[PDB]
Amino acid sequence: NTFLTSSVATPPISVIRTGPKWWAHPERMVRQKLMYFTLGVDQLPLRRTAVIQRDLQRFHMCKPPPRVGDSTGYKRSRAAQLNTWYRRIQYQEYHMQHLFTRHVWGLLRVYPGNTTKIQGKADDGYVGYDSVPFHRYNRAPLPFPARELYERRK
Amino acid sequence: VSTGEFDHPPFQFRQRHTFNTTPLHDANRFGGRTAYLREIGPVNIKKQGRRFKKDPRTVQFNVDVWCAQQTLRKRWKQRDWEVIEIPFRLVPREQQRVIPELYTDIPQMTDPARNDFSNIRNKVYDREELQGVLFPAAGAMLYPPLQRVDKQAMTLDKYL
Amino acid sequence: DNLQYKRYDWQGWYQRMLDVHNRNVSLRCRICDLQRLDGNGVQFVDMQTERRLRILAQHRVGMGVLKLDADKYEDQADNVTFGTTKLSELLADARKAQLGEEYWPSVELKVRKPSGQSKAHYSLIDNERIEKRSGELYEKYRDAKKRSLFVTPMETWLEVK
Amino acid sequence: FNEFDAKGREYVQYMREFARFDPRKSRGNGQKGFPFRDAYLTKMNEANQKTPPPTLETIMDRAVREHHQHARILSPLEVQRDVGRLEPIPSYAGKINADRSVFPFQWKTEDWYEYEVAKVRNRRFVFENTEEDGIRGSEVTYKIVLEGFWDHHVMKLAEDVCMFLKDVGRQIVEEKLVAVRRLLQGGAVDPELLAAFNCARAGPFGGLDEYDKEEVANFLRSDLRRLEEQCLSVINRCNVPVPGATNIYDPHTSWPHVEKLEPWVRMAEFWTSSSDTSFTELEMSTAHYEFRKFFRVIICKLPFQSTEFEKRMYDIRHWLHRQTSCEFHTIYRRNVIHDSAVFPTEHDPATPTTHEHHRMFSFALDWQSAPVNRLSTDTVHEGESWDAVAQRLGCSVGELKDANAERETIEAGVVINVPVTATRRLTSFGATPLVLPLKRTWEEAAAILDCTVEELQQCNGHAALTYQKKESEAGEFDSSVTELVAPLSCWTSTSESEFSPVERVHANDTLVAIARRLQCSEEALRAVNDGITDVSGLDFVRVPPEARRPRRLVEPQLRPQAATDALLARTIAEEETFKLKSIPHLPQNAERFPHEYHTPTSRFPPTPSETPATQDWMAYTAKYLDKQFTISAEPAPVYNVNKLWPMQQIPGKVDQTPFEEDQTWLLHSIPVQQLEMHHHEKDLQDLPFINHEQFPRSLEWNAP
Amino acid sequence: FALRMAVANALVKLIPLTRIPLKKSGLLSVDRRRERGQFPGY
Amino acid sequence: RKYPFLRRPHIKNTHSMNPSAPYFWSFMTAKSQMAFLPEENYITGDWTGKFFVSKRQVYTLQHATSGAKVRVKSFPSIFEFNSPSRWNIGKEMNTLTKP
Amino acid sequence: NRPEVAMHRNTVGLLPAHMWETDKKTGKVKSVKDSVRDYQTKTPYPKWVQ
Amino acid sequence: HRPVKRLFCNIGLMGPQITTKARWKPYRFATNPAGTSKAERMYQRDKTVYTHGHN
Amino acid sequence: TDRFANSLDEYAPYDPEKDSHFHPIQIGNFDEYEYRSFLRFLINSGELAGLGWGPLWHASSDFERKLYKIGFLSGRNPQGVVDHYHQELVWRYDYQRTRQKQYLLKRRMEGMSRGAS
Amino acid sequence: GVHRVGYTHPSTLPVPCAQRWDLRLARARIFQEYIEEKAPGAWQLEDERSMSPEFKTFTGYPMRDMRPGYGQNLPDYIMKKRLPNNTHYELFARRDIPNEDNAMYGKYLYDMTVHGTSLPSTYRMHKDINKAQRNDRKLSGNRFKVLCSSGAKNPPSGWEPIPDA
Amino acid sequence: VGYTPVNPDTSPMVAYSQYHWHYNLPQGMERPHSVNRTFAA
Amino acid sequence: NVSYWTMNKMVRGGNLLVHRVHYTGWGTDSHLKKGGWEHRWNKVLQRNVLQYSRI
RNA sequence: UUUUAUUCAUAUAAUUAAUAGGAUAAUAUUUGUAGUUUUUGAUACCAUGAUAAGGAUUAUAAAUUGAAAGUGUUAAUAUCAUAAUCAAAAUUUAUUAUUUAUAUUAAAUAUGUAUGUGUAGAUAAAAUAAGA
Known about the structure:
Chain E is an all-alpha fold. Chain E has helices at 2-14, 19-24.
């Protein structure tokens, strides 16, 4: 797309921990919903993470209930189970978002950023006009007309 | 109102290209005008590096002047007219008055007694009626008369 | 001054600095007050004279009040006479819109571009000659196509030195 | 007030004043003339004029509830939420109709911007001394600004000075009221006043104004009644503030009233660690302190000029409070005489001045300081008669004889005084140079020209270079020098060397318009044009000498060339001696490189070359593509069209209007700011964080 | 949030009985939170 | 320690690098080449002898044609511009020192 | 020409290519000959002066 | 690159798309010689010549 | 984030009466009836086609709340209706379902207590 | 775009009127305004940061010239700039004296009026007292640094310093 | 304190000390001095 | 017009009349609170120059 | 048998004592006021103050939009009141929080060298209009 420079990768836990700033930003979530809808597939994981984020952000101000009253034997384990279950749902949504972004890029002839893999037509990470002459993680030298991934016309 | 940005992002530690973070002088910002301020590559501050590309004031003024140029071009694209000097005798009654200069009076109105309250300085007159004054010697048939739809006519839109 | 810049040596230059800083003199004159009959028997400023005066004083006139702020000289005694002289010059030049209509300032009128209904005839001007030329241009186009795969408008009608 | 809070009291006041706002009343004052912007702009917005009716669903639901269910739908205001009380229905239950023109406020961005800028600009354009009755309207206005280190100090000083000025003004206005009443009881009309009234040559009824003592006394009585009313208003507003209830800030309640002003607060930010530790530690050890100065403004609006009151208010600086200062602003009515003699009204010169006369340093080189010297003396010529002199000077015989009545007759050569209101008065230092022909030395030439020898030498210039040591050698070189130019001080004007000999006829000027413009008779114009009665036949029509209103050659207040030639005479002599034909400022192929050779006055973006067919698509078609096009260009009007608006670029100069596409702006040669920002007025104050203020005046200080 | 608070106050001024629901929902409750001021130390 | 932009308290800290071919004129010199030479190139009054020319003086042809010795102040006691050439014309002395 | 607006207009004719000895194999400038020696000038000072 | 973009803007047959829709190579990539075919060309240019990246 | 990436750079006023030879027909935004039908189709057909909340239907309010809220958000402009129909996913201050869940839970707790007693 | 600005004379006009360029020339003559000829028409940049009410820093006046290549060297800046005479610089140059009690009055005159003799500085007095105490204690190790050594190297006739011990 | 004496005019300490007038007072005129009229020169 | 050390000494002593505010704020001034040093700079310029008619 | 970051750049050169008023004022050449030469702490020493680091805990429930940042000491440093032979213009001299790939030098002389899969050890910071 318009962003073609080198990029670093971050664990999904970091983006999930980022709340209603990037991961749960309503505009970005609406864009993801539009991407799913224009492809005509259900947005079940997106809606699950949306309701999870809404519930979390609504009560983030409130103080936690007294932990002494809660039973460490069972209540703490139940809370950890629920937190892990929510985190797994958000992981699934994150993976789905990345997969569908790659797929839409491939369909629309959109050249991704450097070292970005688009299954079906790159399969090893497209790199073009990078600061390093060689392909990162592959050590393959790169030509100046970097790579024509798609057909010329249109 | 406006939705875009007008102020240059502040100088901090090096911004890595990741989620919700962009390099400070990436080609996306300001359309492509961060190219002027971009100091490509890792820079050793001891010897390499131009001062003005790091000075927060000069880059801010550059962003301001770029935004001013953008505002000027977007404003001028709205112009579907030109200003012509008329000898004050052939203008209609709504123009035969003491029009104050810009920023020297309250926004005036064209003949408020005629139930017209629009700004007088933003009135635009078509040539279909002004051809007589603009081109008296030419005559002939230039800019044929503008057909005006009859409001009081039973057409399809009137549920005829 | 009355606090610490009196009764001593620095008081003099402090007072001189204050006077130089406050040398500005503002002269205000109303257009309604100007619109009176003069000694000769005519109105001192008419509608055209007022319009010319407003054009001459782009920002010096405002809310119907002509204001001239003179900081020309270090003292108000000379600022006032400079302001009166400049106001007299401005009035003399503005009264010029009474000797004839040639001195009447023109109204800057926003005249629109020709509308779409007028623009629609741009295709139909010289229609018959255009079609007659187009027939022989098609003849030339097919003659060129008989020998060339791609024919540019340069071959048919475009002219390049 | 118990009715509303601060914002309620503000917006209700805004609505009330807009409900009776009238644009005509806005003249004179400043920001007070601007109405409530929210309602004014929404009234000026055309889209708000059309108010959509209630929707079909709304009207159908209301009709079903009323005519079918027998239950009229209650408005939210009239319906009662309280389950324990029946509150009375407010009068504004459903009576107030809905209109987009009034509420809510919707405006357009251009109108909003223009209104805001105009309201900011028009603040000092307030006419304080008017003829209005009430709080406003007076003769003199005094604004005393009291400055103190502490707010309560300046407040108490304001109260003390206000009470003192209240007493003093009551005394002065009381004595003035006594005088006004005594004048109103009876008086004698001043003969000087009657003569002043009887001074207009033509009155408002086409003739003399026969003003008598009865009418002048009536006008004086009206003025005295107005003055008495104003004095009574001042006294009544001054007699109000008893100790029990005193409102010093209200103009109606107290005189003189006091109004607040924003204090001058200047923060100083400095490091506080005496230890010269690291920069981070120094920055962490940073404290903010500020210098404060508090101001109060006292306004005294008196209906007359009172020197005693001015003295008593000036002398308050002697008994001001501790560590308190004061400054005085005076706004008084004055009379300014504008005579048509030193600043006359006439035709523009035949050859108008161009932009080249308005250049940098041009004000000191080719522009005199107005008014220009117009000659009042005149030397009568041989053969000119009493009426001929008046005709030549463009004045009446009666005016001429009134100007020179001590002389019964005018001799062949006499120095007379032209009437002050003459329309054909010459101008000193006529443009025509004076030439002396010698056929002889420098001393003889100076004696015959009545000029100093040094001035003659410096004005001649080349004569000095040609002449050697001996006056005999100077006389020998006089043959080569031929005519000598007289000094500028010796030049004399002529009755025909100042006014245009021919006049330019307009497109639609007949034989009457030209005569009217020149103030001559049609028969005289026809006789001076050799009897031709066709204006269209000739492009230029000569102006007869009988014209009362001629056209000058050039601008009268224009410095001649000799004036600056005397300023730089030695440069001319040196250049003539050294034979400096030209000084090439640019190299050979300077224009070859369009970016290296930039003058300090050169600007960006550079203007591309002009093409004779890029004005419009019709011209482009007629030139290049389909040259068989009948129409040459678009039907341009006969009147001037300004492409760059509201700019006023010099005509005949190739220029480009602001670009409309981002590509042009981006790819055009436009630099960036690489050094410090420099401002002509902000060269002082140094930079931000180094802001310099000589005087700690309030930031929103209003000049008189 | 500022717009919501202003509208809630306007509603309370207009219809007095609407004060109870908005107050119970905490729409007229202002928060005194403020962004950190400028300081060269940080 | 930080100081206002283009107002560094150090005046000689400016290290004039090797001259750049693409500009070679819009760097360490006058912004316009139609401006007059600075005052250091000329003699104001009757002096008794200049110790060494300052580094702000521009280089001219007369420096190499006249043959008179020219020297400037640098890290050592003095530096004389021995072996005059014509390649350095239109440039100031500060661009030919490399401190 | 500076590369700001016009750089492609530079031509080798502007380059003297005679006051230096260049590498006949690579093309780089190997050495530079003396320039002040027997320099040819019509007027060391501008013609109009003196 | 600079004169190419200026020519594309002057011809106007493409319109305002040059800076809004058209994409162009970076500075040091578009300053390469005519035939390179290798991304490791900007690092192989002459280093002894002080020309601010102009070969 | 820019919804107007492909929008035209015109900024030009247009008057069909003065700029066309055809009869102008003015079309306004949806009224109450058309807006209700349009929104009912979008929500219910989307849910039936598998493009709506589906199993998470209880996460969003009922149709009446959606119709009321979206109408305010869009102003009954058909494009605004579509946009806010998609943007409904990020609604934060809709407490209808939360209150109903508490009320129904309270109802069943009382019902179980009545059955036990 | 690129074009040539046209001017039409009132005499050539079908109906005469005062042209805006002529009015501009008259106003420039009245107010002694320098008409800049090389001002490009495509640089009508509004200082939006100070003119737009939508901005925080709105002031209603253009606070910037919007020219990147603007400095104090150019003659336009020289002509339209403000001289520092009678400014805060002039105030500081006379008020920021290291010794405050010297801008009001001369120290010698003030001493000769209020007191009978000119007093020395506090530091000078402290040095004199310390010298007195040192002379009382030791009376050795002191130098004889003076301004003029003539009176010490050639003492006046009849001068005999008495010894100490 | 110090070789440089304090300025009694602008120093808040001496201005608001016990021996001078504090800023929480009416700040009226202390005494109506008249020198030139009692004994002119 | 004194150094930071001198100003700090005079503030800690009773030699200057200043009013202490928060060390990490903008102060009492509305121009400072509504834009900062540059805004107060512009306001000072407007008061000094950009309010007169300048005949 | 919880979260964030860290490659940081100038640094020495030589001389420091006094007061003296002008137009519209009833008179001052005081226009133009003339008595060399007996003293000595910092061109390099004042030790004493501030600062750095930096913590404390009562507000039940209803109402209200409310009723809510505070420092010793230990340390280092330094230009102040305290102990005579010498740093501030001729600056190289190494002094923490920097612009990374569509377009890159026009106004006071304003930076040509560190691309290498962003890969160590240590160090600092915060629960403050944000969303552990």
